[PDB]
Amino acid sequence: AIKRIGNHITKSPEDKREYRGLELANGIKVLLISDPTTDKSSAALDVHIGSLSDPPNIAGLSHFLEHMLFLGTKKYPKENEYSQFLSEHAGSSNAFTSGEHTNYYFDVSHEHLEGALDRFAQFFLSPLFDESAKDREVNAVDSEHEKNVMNDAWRLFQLEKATGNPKHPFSKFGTGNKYTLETRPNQEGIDVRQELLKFHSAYYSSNLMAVVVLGRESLDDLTNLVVKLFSEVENKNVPLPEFPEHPFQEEHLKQLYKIVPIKDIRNLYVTFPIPDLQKYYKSNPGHYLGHLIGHEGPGSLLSELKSKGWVNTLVGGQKEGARGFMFFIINVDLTEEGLLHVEDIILHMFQYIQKLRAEGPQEWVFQELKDLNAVAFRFKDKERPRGYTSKIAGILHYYPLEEVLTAEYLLEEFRPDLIEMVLDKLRPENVRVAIVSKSFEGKTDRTEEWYGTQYKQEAIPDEVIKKWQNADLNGKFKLPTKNEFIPTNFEILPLEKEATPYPALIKDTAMSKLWFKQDDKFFLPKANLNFEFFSPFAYVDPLHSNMAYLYLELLKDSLNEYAYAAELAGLSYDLQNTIYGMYLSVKGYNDKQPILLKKIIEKMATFEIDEKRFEIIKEAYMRSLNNFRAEQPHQHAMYYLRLLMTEVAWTKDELKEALDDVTLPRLKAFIPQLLSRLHIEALLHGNITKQAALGIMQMVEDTLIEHAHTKPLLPSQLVRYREVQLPDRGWFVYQQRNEVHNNSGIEIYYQTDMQSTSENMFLELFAQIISEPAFNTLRTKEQLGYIVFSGPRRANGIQGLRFIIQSEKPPHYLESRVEAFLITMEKSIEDMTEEAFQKHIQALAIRRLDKPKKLSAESAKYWGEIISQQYNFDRDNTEVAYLKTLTKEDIIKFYKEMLAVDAPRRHKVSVHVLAREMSQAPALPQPEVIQNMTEFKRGLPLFPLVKPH
Amino acid sequence: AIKRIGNHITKPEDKREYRGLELANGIKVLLISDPTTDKSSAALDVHIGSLSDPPNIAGLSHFLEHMLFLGTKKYPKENEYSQFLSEHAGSSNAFTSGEHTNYYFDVSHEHLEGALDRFAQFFLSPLFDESAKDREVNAVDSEHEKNVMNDAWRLFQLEKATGNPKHPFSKFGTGNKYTLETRPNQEGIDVRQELLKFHSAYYSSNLMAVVVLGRESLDDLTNLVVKLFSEVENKNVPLPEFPEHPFQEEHLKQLYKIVPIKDIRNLYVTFPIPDLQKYYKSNPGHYLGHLIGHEGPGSLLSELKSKGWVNTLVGGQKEGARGFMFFIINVDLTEEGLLHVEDIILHMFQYIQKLRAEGPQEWVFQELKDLNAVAFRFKDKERPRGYTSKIAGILHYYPLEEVLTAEYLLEEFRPDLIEMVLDKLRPENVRVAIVSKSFEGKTDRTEEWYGTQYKQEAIPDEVIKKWQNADLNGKFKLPTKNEFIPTNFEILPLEKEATPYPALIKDTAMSKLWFKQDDKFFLPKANLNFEFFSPFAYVDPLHSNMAYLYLELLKDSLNEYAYAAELAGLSYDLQNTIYGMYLSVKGYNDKQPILLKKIIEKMATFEIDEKRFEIIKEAYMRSLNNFRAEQPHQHAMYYLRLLMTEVAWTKDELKEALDDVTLPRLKAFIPQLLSRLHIEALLHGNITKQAALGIMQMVEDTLIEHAHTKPLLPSQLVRYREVQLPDRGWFVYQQRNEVHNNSGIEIYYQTDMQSTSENMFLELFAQIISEPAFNTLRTKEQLGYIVFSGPRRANGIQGLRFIIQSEKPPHYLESRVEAFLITMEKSIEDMTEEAFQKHIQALAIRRLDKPKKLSAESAKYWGEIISQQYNFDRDNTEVAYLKTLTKEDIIKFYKEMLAVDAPRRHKVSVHVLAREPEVIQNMTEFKRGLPLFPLVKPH
């Protein structure tokens, strides 16, 4: 079905990726990306057949069939052969399914696109449906639904899908488990594979495909490659499944629900089923609704709710739904009188809607949002060849080929009829209510069948209703003022004579530390700024940590109302506690960095506290404390492990207990004492100059000395923290019982040595070589569990090797198969040939060496090095040049007498996490019981620290 | 002369019963029988002084009682008695006073009969031939020659000389070259005629008082020496006494200006007062001695120090002859004390008028009464020589029942006597004597005997009557009392918890309580030690400075209440720790709950005065930038004690941080420390466990009562670890003293943690190189004066140190130290067994020693609990393991860590230079790349 139509695609003029689109005669919208300078090539394929397009008897059939579409072709009927060719050239495919789409994507290392795409086209010929792939992938779909059993967003999602008309096919079930895929069909005698081959042959080939290929050859050669390669798919003309009305057909409207979640949260949910406006992408009323409802400005709804102290944060807007209709949500946090006086809350909502009904739509908001998305859209930097192409392929169904990039990202017109129409749609006649609170025990009878949430109707009497329609007035509510953080600084600064490729210490004092680099590649009017404020007092005591976090918490609570316009304009910020101190990250444009930073430094320099707002902050973070008995036991193990593997660390119980006495005057005395004496370390990166960096930095520290009288710190009070020495042959462990999860976790730690030139490439290469066979034999082959991880841990200037594994097992039994895996690796090293080794270190070499593709990434990497005080910005040459100079026997020496169980250099410690109720292993040394972790750490050495490069 | 008077003798801790009796020749005999004395003794007092001297020859009686030593008729040889003293440990001495001549000696063990028969034939036959005369006159010339620089006899002779020169109080007491053989022979007077006249008619007559500290029995030496001493013959020698004070309105209301030889500055105030020797019932002048030298609430010296003029004072009842007595007040002088003398005397008269206003007091009387009753009850011991001669000194004046309650007990209250001496404490009665170096060109009147010069300079009348006229009540007020329970001081019997080492009777996350009852000493004593652990003590220079100054002014605060309790016999000490605060309570079992409750209530609710803060601030600031001025070995010790701990705030940043200490910032600092804290506690001595728990409960209840103290977390009862050296490195750098030209240096060796092997490895090698260091380094090489070696117990880690200040190149000095260490290596390896064994026995007795008081074992046990070791049986184990060693054993200790080729060498030095390996640029960056030692497991 060879067909082709393409030309210039509007491409946000910073990019060099040459574009074309085409559509074959079998309903295959192919997008052509030609960037002959790309490192990673990739391709992706979306089919507009979703899980609302499932057969009505078996749900997630297309889901499991595209799982099965992976394995087994007619040209290569081998099971993993596609994935095996992605292991030959480092590719990592995945695919996904939505209510309207089923989307596929893969990658390839550089140029091997003929190979992988040849393995990719012939999926349509012969799926196999053998014992292993079918009967094991259905187990993975069961685990897939099972990990989403307790995931509350999908829970409340499916309950939204389910509490409408159960007759309407919008209310179908999106993803089924093994009970629905091969337990109900065969007990009903339904052949699963007949359905499978039916769907696969008669439904895939028809239409609705979307394709994108990131190739680096040209447009035309890859065009007559693929259009030649793709003619086997033939147009069967399956029609597009659309729904012309929502299921919420007057049985479930103007109704309340009180739902019991899995996590202890409190949220309010109001929903409006609304028709589609995808046809109006040139005017886009949905960005106007989300921009105007979720605005945080003067006279806004959220400003009033902060003023009444009911909502911490919120999100609302138009949510996608079926093809014909969509949804409109408002999601807010709840306090005390958020729990008791919900009626008045909805009255306040009606008041804000009354303000929207008073002044109606606005044009200056249109023009302003148009300019913001216009300029911000045309300054895309670059993109990842994976994920971006899957996104564009995801939206390639809805747009002609020149509108696939400027989808709503250019707005010509203004359609107040639409905004007034959906304003007419947003009425008390059109309301679904869902209350989320854990506290509704003994109160909620109607239980969810699949996931298990519990709820009730509590029909609203007519008095409240009649008062809701007639009493809609305006009080404080005002339209949101025009933005002022709109940028004009779009001038690329020419590079100076100072042409360093890395940030130099351009300012050295006893007060500060200043690192700076101007960009050379991305050529954007943007900058990234990171700042840490050292302090001794940040982690001295649980009380100090509590007052630091609650202080900075209400600080961020304070600065929200000013920051909202800048953050909506593309000027991000961050406030963060460390054990060291406050952490300030600033990311945005080149225009208004002094302005924003100045008001931030001035605000947190002299700062004031509200009473009942802080009472809410106290209560809320107090609820956030005791929620740390409910996490995944691998997270519990990683928390405790890096708890133990530092110098000082406060436990969450003792941090939880210290808030019993924290009053506002104790804090208000504490604050300037905390702020009294501190240091500042700074990285500045982006399209600014050295002199302006000097200016900004001097400005900040001057502002600080003006407000809070910061004096520099002596070099005998800038300390770091060490990591615990192990007794050089010990294998130590302890256990913790989780209460929520019926699963055991484990993490085992191996101290090699500091980051020296030998140890870096030893531990990285050995990590790589223990990475893929662990996945190949422990999660895949031995079928231990789903949470299986192996690899490095370099922290506190100390390298390490780790295994992060969560299953439902006895932990010494788990240890036994860990050691069996260690013996398995032990023999699997010694039997490896030279060529596998050479491909493996070539893989390591190209995996490690790469420049990033975003300025935010590499700045965060450099900052993460600077907070570790290493500064070796030329790890690349040193490490890569060292890596060629390794042998097999080096690793043998690295494994046997240092890492193995028969080793005089065992720096070995395991962590057991016990569940809520609880092929050869040798005779390991005896463990230790650990009662007091402190009395364990009592007599134990501590490491040196690292010489900075 | 067998006369006899005896009965039951009242004496209560001591049980050795003694008894007094009078002989018919006028000898007061006291029997002392102590069969537990090593050296026995005896003493005789003669009530013949230098007031019986002839007016023509001065100091005759001192030379005559000297002449009785040499020459008997049994043994007229020159050193023969002296040979009986050198063979039998004897050492006699005797003196002459205004009214007494007293004899006292010792003897080796039991040599009674020998010394007795010699002591009879001293008084039966003295010979006085020629050689005794002509040789004893040189000893008397030395008796005069020793008083050139002897200030006691100089100032006292100046007291003898500034009165009536006709009165026999103006005679001399010793006799010099001039009066003994320059003054008689030109007058032709025979000295020996008067010597035999004086000896016969005045020495031999009466008024002897013998006392003999013996170990033999109570009756055998008694009926030996009763018959044996009849050689004394009654002649009724008159008592040379004065019926009036010798300073009689010639020199009254007069000043003196004295120029000394030593640079001292003093002010002397004198009141002559009539005899109250009969008045031992109330003893008002000594009661005034209680009221003058009191330094307490509302005292005189409180304002005088508060005006900053007078350093110290002393006052009280000074004896004279029998007839008269004196009352003196003698103070120290500052520079500006010279300028405000009139105001000083003005405040003195203000205090006199305050005592005249409120009159006598009874509480003071009962208080002194009870305090001397307890101090009489709990007397320690006695000197084997001198005690006898002293109580024989008061045996002349008191009946046989009053010889023990000598001044330690008072019968009656006499306010009329106090008003009498208040009539004596008037501006009409004052005698003034100023001692100052600055009186140059000022002192005309020359002393008669010595030849120094002084001057009267009477005060003109504007100031005299202003002393009279201004007699007002001001500031000065009465003291306070702590006489809670003077009846119960009972010993507490040891119960079923018979442990020789302290048991932990209470441990929480809030406190830690260790307990031991006495077994050895069984005294009315108790010792209490308290550590108050808190995180906030060493957070920065600022909180550490504010904690230091906090407890500093707390010590300044407590004092004002504390002095009246200190008068009751309960001492204390506050000094903080680097961890937290440390509290000491030492004393009786009597009233420390009542005390300690008020101590906690005060240090919990604490205030600051502003100028008090300023003075302590400036003063410690001065003490800080003063520390740049001391000896460079102290610089090396303290800066190495910085370089080898976990965290350390230096004195430079401690010095700078005092700019920021304001009173409200401290006022915020106070409850923050006090909000949450930990207590470490030892209660040790003859005390109980259950009441210790009740007291501890009172403590924590008071802590919750004031600041709502809740415990500290159990991962923050931490210690500080010590830095691990890089296993072979010997690195060095230098420091600079600023003031002194001397160089400092310190040499360091890390062996190990305190294990049982390492304690004795360390002690044994340290002392085995200690005595040859005496043999070759200070004596032979003459390196310096600050030369020290020995252990280094720090953060539970042993170490070896060498403390040397000299003026040397430091590497040169290191070179000869290491040459001494190589010398010690061969000097061990050539050692025989005998040196080795004598040395390990030396070390054995060096380490092994029984305690001597509750405070000693308390200091040891608590001194180990503060190191968290708790190894309470190091005594047997450690020392028994030291005996199981050879010399090559400590060589094996000296090879792997201590030798020059050592593979575990942990050696690091500190040079402190005058003002005129690897380097260490930054001590933080030094400690950046080096490992750390672990901590010690508490037993």
Author numbering:
A (entry chain A): 46 to 963, 981 to 1011
B (entry chain B): 46 to 56, 58 to 962, 989 to 1011
Which of the paper's sentences describe this entry?
IDE can effectively degrade insulin, amylin, and glucagon, pancreatic hormones that control blood glucose levels, as well as amyloid β (Aβ), a peptide implicated in Alzheimer’s disease. IDE is a 110 kDa zinc metalloprotease that readily dimerizes in solution (Kd =~ 10 nM). IDE has at least two major conformational states in its catalytic cycle; open-state IDE captures substrates and releases products while closed-state IDE performs catalysis. Within the IDE dimer, each IDE subunit consists of ~55 kDa N- and C-terminal domains, IDE-N and IDE-C.
Further 3D classification revealed three major conformations and structural models were built. We again applied IDE dimer-focused classification with signal subtraction of the IDE-FabH11-E dimer to refine each conformation separately, which improved the resolution significantly. The three apo-IDE structures derive from combinations of the IDE partial open (pO) and open (O) states. The three conformers have resolution limits which correlated well with their relative populations: O/pO (4.2 Å, 73%), O/O (6.5 Å, 16%), and pO/pO (6.9 Å, 11%). Furthermore, two subunits within O/O or pO/pO states have noticeable differences in the distance and buried surface between IDE-N and IDE-C and the dihedral angle. The IDE pO and O states differs from the pC and C states by 5 Å to 24 Å increases in the distance between D1 and D4 and 7° to 17° increases in the dihedral angle, respectively. These changes result in decreased buried surface between IDE-N and IDE-C in pO and O states. Open-state IDE has an opening just wide enough to capture its substrates, for example, insulin, TGF-α, and MIP-1α/β, allowing the IDE catalytic chamber to attract these substrates with high dipole moment via charge complementarity. Our cryoEM structures reveal that only open-state IDE can capture its prototypical substrate, insulin, and release cleaved products.
